Amino acid sequence: DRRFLKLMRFYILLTGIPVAIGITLVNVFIGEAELADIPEGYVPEHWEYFKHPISRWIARTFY
Amino acid sequence: MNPFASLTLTTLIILTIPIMMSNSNIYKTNLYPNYVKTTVSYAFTLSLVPLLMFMHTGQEMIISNWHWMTLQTVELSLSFKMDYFSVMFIPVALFVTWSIMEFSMWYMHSDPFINRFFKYLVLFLITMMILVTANNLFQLFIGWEGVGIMSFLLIGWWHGRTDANTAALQAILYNRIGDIGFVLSMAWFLTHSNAWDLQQIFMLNNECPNMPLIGLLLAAAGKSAQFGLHPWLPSAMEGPTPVSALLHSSTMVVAGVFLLIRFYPLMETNKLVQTMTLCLGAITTLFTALCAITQNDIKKIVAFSTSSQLGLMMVTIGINQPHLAFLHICMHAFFKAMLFMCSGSIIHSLNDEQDIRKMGGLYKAMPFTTTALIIGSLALTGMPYLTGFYSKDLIIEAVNMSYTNAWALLMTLIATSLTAAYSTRIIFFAFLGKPRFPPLVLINENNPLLINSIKRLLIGSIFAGFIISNNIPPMTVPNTTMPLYMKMTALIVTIMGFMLALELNNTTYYLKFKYPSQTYKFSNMLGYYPSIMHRLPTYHNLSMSQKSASSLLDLIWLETILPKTTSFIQMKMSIMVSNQKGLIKLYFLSFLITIMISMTLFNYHE
Amino acid sequence: IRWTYARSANIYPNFRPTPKTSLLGALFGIGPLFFWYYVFKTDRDKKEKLIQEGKLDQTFNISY
Amino acid sequence: AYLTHQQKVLRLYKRALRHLESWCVHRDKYRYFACLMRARFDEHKNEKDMVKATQLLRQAEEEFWYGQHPQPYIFPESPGGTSYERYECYKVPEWCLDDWHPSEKAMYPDYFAKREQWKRLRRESWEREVKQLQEETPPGGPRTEALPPARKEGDLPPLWWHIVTRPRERPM
Amino acid sequence: MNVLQIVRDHWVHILVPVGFVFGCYLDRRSDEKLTAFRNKSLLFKRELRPNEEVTWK
Amino acid sequence: DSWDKDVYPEPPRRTPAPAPQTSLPNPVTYLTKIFDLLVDRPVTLAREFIEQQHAKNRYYYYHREFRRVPDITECEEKDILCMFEAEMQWRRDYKVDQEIVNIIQERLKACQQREGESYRQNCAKELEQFTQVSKAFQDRYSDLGAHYSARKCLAKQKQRMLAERKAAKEAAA
Amino acid sequence: IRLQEDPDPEDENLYEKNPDSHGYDKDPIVDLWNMRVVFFFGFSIVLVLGSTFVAYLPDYRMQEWARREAERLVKYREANGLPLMESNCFDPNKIQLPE
Amino acid sequence: MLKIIIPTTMLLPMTWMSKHNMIWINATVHSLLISLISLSLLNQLGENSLNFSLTFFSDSLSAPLLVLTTWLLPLMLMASQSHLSKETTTRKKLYITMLILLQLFLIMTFTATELILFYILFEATLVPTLIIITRWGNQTERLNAGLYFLFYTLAGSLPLLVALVYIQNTTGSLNFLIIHYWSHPLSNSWSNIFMWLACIMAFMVKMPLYGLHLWLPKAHVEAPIAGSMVLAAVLLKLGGYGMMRITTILNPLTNYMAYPFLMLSMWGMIMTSSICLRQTDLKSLIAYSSVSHMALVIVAIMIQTPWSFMGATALMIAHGLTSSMLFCLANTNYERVHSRTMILARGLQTLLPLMATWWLMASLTNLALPPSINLIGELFIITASFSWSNITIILMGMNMMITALYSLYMLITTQRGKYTHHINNIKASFTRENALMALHILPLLLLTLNPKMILGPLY
Amino acid sequence: APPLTLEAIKDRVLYVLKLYDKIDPEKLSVNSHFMKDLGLDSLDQVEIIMAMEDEFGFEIPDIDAEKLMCPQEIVDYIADKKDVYE
Ligand SMILES: CCCCCCCCCCCCCCCCCC(=O)O[C@@H](COC(=O)CCCCCCCCCCCCCCC)COP(=O)(O)OC[C@H](O)CO
């Protein structure tokens, strides 16, 4: 019973913390986007229309 | 930017840290109970400050935060509303449970799963603090169900005991029927007023809440254990003594009346529902007290005293005095928690025996526990200028000074006179008199944890009302000019309540025989409610479930209507279409029939 | 094992369409279903009349 | 088996006085009223009319079933007592120890060593146990559920394990 | 160790990834057959960018 | 703040001047001063790091502006080529109209708590604003059905002036 | 003898041979590897990593986008004294009412 | 899709052409990988359903169900590699073939663009399931269960085939897009009533309303654990997906014809939930519990309200994880005790303390406590139905009370109480059984943070 | 609570049997059946273990109580029930 709980807690953290520090890092390295009107004669990128940089990256990837 | 914004949430988030550490298992498997006690004690210290700017500044705020989900025109989001009721109820809840946590490491100094017990208490604790701090009805439903299920585990803590599960089942049962009114009030507000935030419901002037308020009343009735939906609370004793000391004193059963306090501004508009509160409140006081004074168990008497108080509590709502109801909530916390505090101390010391017939003589033997019991019992009656008189006596004076429904006024009066009766029964068969317990006496109370826990509650239950009543901003017009007899009646009714009770109690001291009384037979059997309404309806519903519902309908007819009839129809005729005798004479004769009939009457020829 | 079989399997082979089971089947069967049909339709018809004539008030009811 | 005249009245005595305690309380009363009931119990002690003795038992229980206290007093460690099955939550059966992990078993080597002595004893004693029963069982199966003792020498009593190795009432 | 042996044991692990690699190929090929009114809808009508030749592909 | 003040109009906040009478100091004031340079100042310092780091390399985003197209009132029947654009525009306006009620509801709740127990009298214009919004919403989409569509709005609406003109001709008589 | 069938087989205990067994197979080395793959690709890649993925999709249903147009629409309508949300979505000028 | 389908079918040779004992390892690893791909498809555009090709398209209703099926697929392999460990490789590999062949059919069923294409695989799930119940099922009644399960849904599904082809001859194409864009008022006439009956009864057999539910206690109980999950976690919701979709050309008629099934379902939930209180088999208890919660979804659709569908999809998927998990719970003790009678294995919390926990949130989730999706599903339907008629809360509200009574009854009778003395073949829970349950409970709580992904297309 | 060891038990037993005014203290014997050696009534014998029951704060089942007759076996019965092993 303890070993299984130890296995989950240790291993689920194995990817937990690197993503957790990653989410904070992007929030404290490049920051969040801010509102801006549509510039003249510029087509906005499909992924550019989103606030969170990870969200923008997710839009740049598969979607 | 005031601390009233961030701190009032900090005193909520810090309640969750001990829960998380248990998952990490870094939680101190040696001194976890002290970890919980100190954390709750700390949160009480944090819970102090929001009170101060409530008295000084008088500010009331509402917190809206992370948006769960946006539902068309319903923005269901996490929300915390710091109202006078919420901000006042936080410190008293933590202070009471911090004292209870102090008691637990004394009473539970031997339970092997003690760490699990403290884990449940915090989970219960955090569950109510969001129940009392809610702004949207759905989050108010978050804690409402959470406290019930948490109470289920806590009552069934001694899960080996069969009757503990049955009482645990009873608690979740009556809660569910009470819950039906909550979900009914849930849909009505969403359909008509188109929200669950308390701001919109009050804003949209739902002055015809006839059905929602009836559901709201039903929700309170199940949780606060009023007549009809109550015997779970008297039977919620299989759980350990600290459990009933925390949950079923003023920190689980109170939830029902506190719900009505939240919805007070629209409750006063309707008159039928509030009158029904006088009906339910008045009868609850008596039938609990009537079945209380004839109980030979200290824990049963104490729990019955609670249900009478909340029975008295909803009476205060019915006269459009909801703030005074909340005053009664805080004051009742200090008394009844110590009442269960005292019982837990004597029970454990006297070889975990609760039958009130086996105490006596502990007055000189147990001075401190005796002093606290005198403190609590006298507060319960309403000793002037004590924490009891600051709420109960004011309530009775306000009760008669209104358009009270005649019988409700009389019913509370006799109940409050009956309030002292079981209190005397406690002090009489307990310390006062000649002892009756087994010979080996191990009466010990000198444990520092037990002494400090009771003393902490003791000091509170003398100056609690003074501090609260003086510091609270006046939110209710008082009544100043009373005819003397009914302004004094609250004091006097307990004076006879003392007077006859001691007379009939010392009547047992008389050497002559005591005849069995049929009224006593009715009273001592909890008014026959469990013996009737718990084995008659359960049998009928469950016997219907198997004999007819699960047997006659499911696999006696439903499997017979469609499946077996079709199978039998195919069965019967497949015999008839597969039992040819192989005679070519019969075969070709049938050919003659078909060729004759086909060329004929069916008009295939044209 | 005998009890579990008796409460689950033996029930139908031992079944007999006596009028006692027949009437009790309809009484606990079609009976309640039609009874709920009557009350629900009666109220439903009562509601829709007031809605159509404009008697019922739902001015704040939007999220149906 | 059945309950003869003396057992029925003795049970009636035992249960009535316990009920009388819940009624009378205040020990001074208890001893006085016990003496009264005992006195009026003494007067009829021979009454060789067994029919009359049963007749005197009729209103005896009827009086009990009318005058019994609705909440009879029971010491907590009793059926219906407040401390009933309280510690049944913790009496884990002994056979569960066999599934302990070897590293976990290493924490208590001497006790596990003692478990081996008891285990090998129950393995040896089992054969003699069944032999005694079959060579002593009366015709037509066991008439009485009572088990026999270890009539031979150096022999364990029949069906000795579970009663002897039962979990203690206070395992904590 | 023993590349041939691990291939004999664990070579099957590639079929699903290449199937996914296959999977993306149709979605970037079947779309061409469904082009039709690409850059024809009124709502998303945008002027031809100066190096771009078509919209979404 | 970043959000527009006109969209969420917060009436001016009138604050009393602390003028105590008793000589003993206010525990509120002293504790808040302790709360000031224990939590707020470290929070302000930490945020300034974040804001200065965010402003060091700023990246922008805009808001998509879907150009309006002919709706289902001009799209000829059995022309799903134009119905799809018309249907999508109506569903897009559906969500926008849902947000309009969301905005008005938030203003309604905001005034209710802001005025405390003076809620009923101070902000009654908010209630009549929300009442008119919901009433028009009831004339609109409400009761379309689970599978709501721009066609169903046309049917529900067109049914309404049918009654309205029927009412109008009767009133004129 | 009715017939020649083996009796009921004994329910084997995976712990009896190797107490360190993870309840995944008979062979110890694959049990550890089965335990690795079920966890690693069960929680980290899908549960943990997927949760961050699913938590961080772009605007779902153009939700905040829908809110944004309301503000300017709100500011437009009340400033010029026109009811902030018209009763009929489809403009009656466009449609024709028969008879 | 031509994106998740190929990896699923390419997994079929992968199970066949693999090492002897590595079949479970390889199948489990890549099945989870398939799910990870499916997690992406969850995001949906506001109004237009996500269209991939002419044959396949996914809306915001298929996607929440689609990820569940893919995420389910590893769980049966985990839950079934215990009792089948004593079986030949060929039959072992064949079992993996049956499951993934089943999961392939659901993947192309939920995403089908054409109703006829939807029907073809909607029924095609019958064949691999019937193999699973009959072949590897461990009981005698499984033969009768297979016939009951097959004929019930097939006899209902045949009118759907006749109904669907009739729509083809009348309204041209039948894909889920043009049907919703070219909707016409179904004129109230006796023929259209029978058209309505055909277009609905097929799906309503799948999610068993009261009366047409006798195949659940037969199929689910006798089926193996891997089969037991799918017959209660996806195929019950298969009727749901069809019911949402097909209720697009039947809505001048649903209002008038909802009454007979609505009263049957509304009374059924009180009826079915009552069956639980006096049950004997744990597996039947869960199966009958599935009838009541699903019968709530029957009401959820037939009211046809934006809230009603909104709580419908939330309830079905929350139902799937919960009931599948409870079916694992029944399997764990059943393998260790070799009987399904509840009272036989009393007092199991003291022996297995983690299984006590895993059962605790299992029964708690079936309680539909807030904020667990079971609550956010049931509570949503309560409000929508209450607006439909006020007396609905009298029935469905009481159902929640009855739901609590048996849901704790199974927890109390088995886990709580004194342990059973004669049973001595109970071993410490394998890390597989515990890990299998964690992958059931954590996802359920994880979605609780964001119901936007679970609220369906009407969101 | 201190362990209720055997000698402490038997000290409590013969202390309350010698308490019985009908049982003379000087003739106390731990192994002496209450009738054939001492002389009493079974009506009195049942009263004895009721006194025992309150002495040790628990219930002696009547089926076992009737078999319980000797002061030493009195100590023996209470010892096993309270799992006293010394
Ligand atoms: C096991 C029994 C069945 C279980 C429950 C299934 C649902 C009950 C209803 C079953 C209906 C089956 C046939 C429906 C196919 C589609 C019909 C349709 O779309 O509607 C037509 C409805 O028309 C019908 O007549 C359909 C069939 C009605 C019922 C008669 C046959 C079905 C009942 C008996 C067979 C099934 C029972 C089992 C028998 C062993 C419209 O055509 P129309 O008649 O308007 O044609 C144009 C013009 O008017 C000329 O006809």
Strands B79-82 and B69-71: unpaired
Rounded-to-integer distance, Cα C45 and Cα D116, Å: 79
Rounded-to-integer distance, Cα H78 and Cα H28, Å: 8
The residue whose CA is least distant from atom 41 of ligand 1 is H191
The residue whose CA is least distant from atom 18 of ligand 1 is H195
Chain C's closest residue to F134, CA to CA, is C60
Taking residue A10's Cβ as centre, other Cβ atoms within 10 Å add up to 11
I23 closest CA partner among I43, I44, I50, I6: I44
For residue D32, what are its two tokens?
């006085």
Strand pairing partners for H341? Answer: H281
G50 contacts: CB under 8 Å, gap ≥ 6: H35, H36, H39
Nearest CA-CA distance, residue A50 and chain G, Å: 7
CA B66 to chain centre: 30
The residue whose CA is least distant from atom 29 of ligand 1 is H194
Rounded-to-integer distance, Cα B327 and Cα B319, Å: 15
Residue G23 Ramachandran class (φ > 0 left, ψ -120 to 50 alpha, else beta): left
DSSP state letters, F37-67? IIIIHHHHHHHHHHHHHHHHS--EE----PP
> Does the beta carbon of H431 lie under 8 angstroms from any beta carbon of chain G?
yes
CA of H197 to the centre of ligand 1 (A): 8
With an 8 Å Cβ cutoff, are H2 and E16 in contact?
no
Helices (H), chain A: 2-29, 53-60
Contacts of H371 in chain B (CB under 8 A): 68, 142
- Give the atom of ligand 1 at the shortest distance from the alpha carbon of H155: 1
- Block residue for tokens 């019965």: I77
Rounded-to-integer distance, Cα E41 and Cα H26, Å: 47
Do C and B have ≥3 inter-chain CB pairs under 8 A?
yes
Write the residue in D85, D89, D162 that is nearest to H350 by C-beta: D89
Instruction: Give CA separation, H456 vs B75, G87, H312, in Å.
Output: 17, 28, 8
Rounded-to-integer distance, Cα B153 and Cα B168, Å: 7
CA H193 to chain centre: 29
- Block residue for tokens 């342990």: H419
Question: For the CA atoms of chain C, what is the radius of gyration?
Answer: 23
- H155 CB within 6 A, ligand 1: yes
Nearest CA-CA distance, residue H234 and chain C, Å: 27
Rounded-to-integer distance, Cα H136 and Cα H86, Å: 12
Write the residue in H25, H46, H86 that is nearest to G33 by C-beta: H25
Helices (H), B472-579: 484-487, 489-507, 518-524, 529-533, 536-544, 559, 565-576
Rounded-to-integer distance, Cα H195 and Cα H442, Å: 43
Rounded-to-integer distance, Cα D37 and Cα D28, Å: 15
Q: Is the dihedral of CA B196, B198, B200, B204 positive or negative?
A: positive
- H197 CB within 6 A, ligand 1: yes
Element (H, E) at H328: helix H306-337
Do B and F have ≥3 inter-chain CB pairs under 8 A?
yes
With an 8 Å Cβ cutoff, are F61 and A48 in contact?
yes
With an 8 Å Cβ cutoff, are H424 and D95 in contact?
yes
- Give the atom of ligand 1 at the shortest distance from the alpha carbon of H189: 45
Helices (H), H278-305: 282-303
I60 closest CA partner among I71, I74, I70, I44: I74
Rounded-to-integer distance, Cα F52 and Cα A31, Å: 10
Residue B512 Ramachandran class (φ > 0 left, ψ -120 to 50 alpha, else beta): beta
Taking residue H5's Cβ as centre, other Cβ atoms within 10 Å add up to 17
Chain A's closest residue to G37, CA to CA, is A11
Helix (H, G, I), strand (E, B) or coil at G56: coil
Q: Which of C34, C40, C51 to mutate to test the interface with H (most CBs of H within 10 A)?
A: C40
Instruction: Give CA separation, B363 vs B373, B427, B443, G64, in Å.
Output: 10, 9, 12, 70
Rounded-to-integer distance, Cα B395 and Cα I86, Å: 61
Strands A34-35 and F60-61: parallel
The residue whose CA is least distant from atom 40 of ligand 1 is B566
Question: For the CA atoms of chain B, what is the radius of gyration?
Answer: 31
Give the amino acid at B499. Answer: M
Helix (H, G, I), strand (E, B) or coil at B535: coil
H230 closest CA partner among H16, H439, H444, H68: H68
For residue B192, what are its two tokens?
């008509």
Burial class of residue D112 (count of CB atoms within 10 Å of its CB; 0-12, 13-18, 19+): middle
For residue F43, what are its two tokens?
């929070």
Cβ–Cβ under 8 Å, residues B84 and B2: no
Instruction: Give CA separation, B474 vs B55, B467, D34, H318, in Å.
Output: 11, 13, 62, 49
Rounded-to-integer distance, Cα B278 and Cα B313, Å: 10
Chain G's closest residue to F139, CA to CA, is G87
CA B606 to chain centre: 85
- Block residue for tokens 């007549």: B227
- H201 CB within 6 A, ligand 1: yes
Question: For the CA atoms of chain D, what is the radius of gyration?
Answer: 25
DSSP state letters, F90-119? HHHHHHHHHHHHHHHHHHHHHHHHHTGGGH
Nearest CA-CA distance, residue C47 and chain F, Å: 15
Give the amino acid at H445. Answer: L
Please give the DSSP secondary-structure letter assigned to residue B446. Answer: -
Against chain A, the chains showing at least 3 CB pairs within 8 Å are: B, F, G, H
Give residue ranges of D with CB < 8 Å to any B CB: 21-29, 32-33, 66-67, 69-71, 73-76, 82-91, 172
For residue H410, what are its two tokens?
């199974």
Write the residue in D32, D70, D75 that is nearest to B521 by C-beta: D70
Rounded-to-integer distance, Cα B98 and Cα B105, Å: 11
Strand pairing partners for A35? Answer: F61
Rounded-to-integer distance, Cα C25 and Cα C20, Å: 8
H295 closest CA partner among H316, H269, H313, H264: H269
Contacts of H442 in chain G (CB under 8 A): 43, 47
Cβ–Cβ under 8 Å, residues H41 and H110: no
B83 closest CA partner among B263, B207, B215, B245: B263
Contacts of I12 in chain B (CB under 8 A): 439-440
Q: Is the dihedral of CA B422, B427, B432, B437 positive or negative?
A: positive
- Block residue for tokens 């299998």: H436
> Does the beta carbon of A42 lie under 8 angstroms from any beta carbon of chain H?
no
The residue whose CA is least distant from atom 31 of ligand 1 is H194
- H256 CB within 6 A, ligand 1: no
Q: Which long-range contacts (CB under 8 A, 24 or more apart) does G24-30 make?
A: G24/H24, G24/H81, G24/H430, G24/H431, G24/H432, G25/H21, G25/H24, G25/H81, G25/H85, G26/H21, G26/H85, G27/H21, G30/H21, G30/H22, G30/H25
CA B583 to chain centre: 84
Q: Please calculate the CA angle D120-D125-D130 and round it to the nearest 5 degrees.
A: 140
Taking residue B595's Cβ as centre, other Cβ atoms within 10 Å add up to 10
Half-sphere exposure of residue D27: CA atoms within 13 angstroms, side-chain side: 12
Q: Is the peptide bond before D142 cis (omega within 30 degrees of 0)?
A: no
Task: Indicate the length of chain D as a whole number.
Answer: 172
Rounded-to-integer distance, Cα B374 and Cα B370, Å: 6
CA of H200 to the centre of ligand 1 (A): 12
The residue whose CA is least distant from atom 16 of ligand 1 is H163
Instruction: Give CA separation, D60 vs B249, B341, D8, D40, D48, in Å.
Output: 44, 43, 11, 12, 18
D110 contacts: CB under 8 Å, gap ≥ 6: none
Chain C's closest residue to F136, CA to CA, is C59
- H191 CB within 6 A, ligand 1: yes
DSSP state letters, chain I? -----HHHHHHHHHHHHTTSTTS-GGG--SS--IIIII---HHHHHHHHHHHHHHHTS---HHHHHH---HHHHHHHHHHHTT---
Taking residue D99's Cβ as centre, other Cβ atoms within 10 Å add up to 18
The residue whose CA is least distant from atom 49 of ligand 1 is H191
- H100 CB within 6 A, ligand 1: no
> Does the beta carbon of D127 lie under 8 angstroms from any beta carbon of chain H?
no
Burial class of residue I45 (count of CB atoms within 10 Å of its CB; 0-12, 13-18, 19+): middle
Cβ–Cβ under 8 Å, residues B137 and B263: no
> Does the beta carbon of H254 lie under 8 angstroms from any beta carbon of chain F?
no
Cβ–Cβ under 8 Å, residues B159 and B116: no
Burial class of residue B61 (count of CB atoms within 10 Å of its CB; 0-12, 13-18, 19+): middle
For residue H279, what are its two tokens?
């049950």
DSSP state letters, H71-131? HHHHHHHHHHTTGGGSS-HHHHHHHHHHHHHHHHHHHHHHTBSBHHHHHHHHHHTHHHHHH
- H163 CB within 6 A, ligand 1: yes
Contacts of I59 in chain D (CB under 8 A): 74-75, 77-78, 81
Cβ–Cβ under 8 Å, residues B502 and B426: no
For residue H409, what are its two tokens?
């009854």
Residues of I assigned a catalytic role: 41
- H159 CB within 6 A, ligand 1: yes
Helices (H), chain C: 2-8, 19-28, 30-53
Give the amino acid at B418. Answer: L
Strand pairing partners for H149? Answer: none
Residue D83 Ramachandran class (φ > 0 left, ψ -120 to 50 alpha, else beta): beta
Nearest CA-CA distance, residue B434 and chain I, Å: 16
Taking residue B598's Cβ as centre, other Cβ atoms within 10 Å add up to 11
For chain H, report the end-to-end CA distance as a whole number of angstroms: 23
Nearest CA-CA distance, residue H432 and chain G, Å: 6
Secondary structure in 3-state letters for chain D = CCCCHHHHHHHHHHHHHHHHHHHHCCCHHHHHHHHHHHHHHHCCCCCCCHHHHHHHHHHHHHHHHHHCCCCCCCCCCCCCCCCCCCCCCCCCCHHHHHHCCHHHHCCCHHHHHHHHHHHHHHHHHHHHHHHHHHCCCCCCCCCCCCCCCCCCCCCCCCCCHHHHCCCCCCCC
